Amino acid sequence: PSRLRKTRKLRGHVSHGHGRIGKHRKHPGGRGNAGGLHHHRINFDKYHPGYFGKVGMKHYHLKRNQSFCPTVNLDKLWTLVSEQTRVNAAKNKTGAAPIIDVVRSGYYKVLGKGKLPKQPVIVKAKFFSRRAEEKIKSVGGACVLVA
């Protein structure tokens, strides 16, 4: 869209939108990130705090494959299973409960949140936070681990 570009409107002006005095030449300050310690520190500090230095232990050959533990919340915990199941299991049927397996959906660790309805369920996961374990024992369901 050269016709909508600013450059077609800017013709007829001598400096083309970069000043007569300043004169955009090639590379005024440097290139890229020149002067990170020397003369751009008032940008680097005050706009990127923490850019210089080492912090942590050096870990070699890291895989983003062993540490794979996605989270799922007690809000989302119902809609991994169809809502026909929670309706039928909530329509005063018997003491029984449905089993919701989050490892089928692809979630390993069940974290706690709020608003878990009183309807008791059985959850199978690889990991549990004690928040969500308290919430499940408070609504009356049970915690089950897998492997």
Partner 1 sequence: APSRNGMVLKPHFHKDWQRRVATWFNQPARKIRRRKARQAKARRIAPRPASGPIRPIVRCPTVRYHTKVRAGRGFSLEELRVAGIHKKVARTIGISVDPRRRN
Partner 2 sequence: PVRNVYKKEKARVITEEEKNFKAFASLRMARANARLFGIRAKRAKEAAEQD
Partner 3 sequence: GVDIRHNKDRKVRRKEPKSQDIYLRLLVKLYRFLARRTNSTFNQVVLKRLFMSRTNRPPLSLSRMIRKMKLPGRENKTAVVVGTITDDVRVQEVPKLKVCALRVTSRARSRILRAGGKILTFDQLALDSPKGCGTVLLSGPRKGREVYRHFGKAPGTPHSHTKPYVRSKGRKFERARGRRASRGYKN
- Which residues bind to Mg ion, rule: CB under 5 A? 22
For 127, phi then psi, to 5°, come to: -140, 155
50, 80, 93, 98, 135 from 85: Cα distances, Å: 51, 11, 12, 7, 20
Burial of 90 (0-12, 13-18, 19+ CB in 10 A): middle
86 binds RNA (CB under 7 A): no
Query: Do the beta carbons of residue 57 and residue 65 sit within 8 Å?
Result: no
Residue with tokens 């409960």: 97
Give the binding range for RNA (CB under 7 A) out of 63-71, 86-94, 95-103: 63-71
55 binds partner 3 (CB under 8 A): yes
Nearest approach, Cβ of residue 109 and partner 3 (Å): 19
Give the binding range for partner 3 (CB under 8 A) out of 9-17, 50-58, 100-108, 126-134: 50-58
For partner 1, the closer of residues 101 and 133 by Cβ is: 101
Q: Residues for the chain: how many in total? A: 147
**In the set 18, 24, 34, 138, which binds partner 1 (CB under 8 A)?**
34
Nearest approach, Cβ of residue 142 and partner 2 (Å): 4
- Residue 22, binding choice from partner 2, partner 3, Mg ion, none, Cβ under 5 to 8 Å by partner class: Mg ion
Helix (H) or strand (E) holding 145: strand 142-145
DSSP 8-class letter at 103: H
54 binds RNA (CB under 7 A): no
Q: What does the binding site for partner 3 look like in residue numbers (CB under 8 A)? A: 45-56, 75-76, 78-79, 86, 115, 117
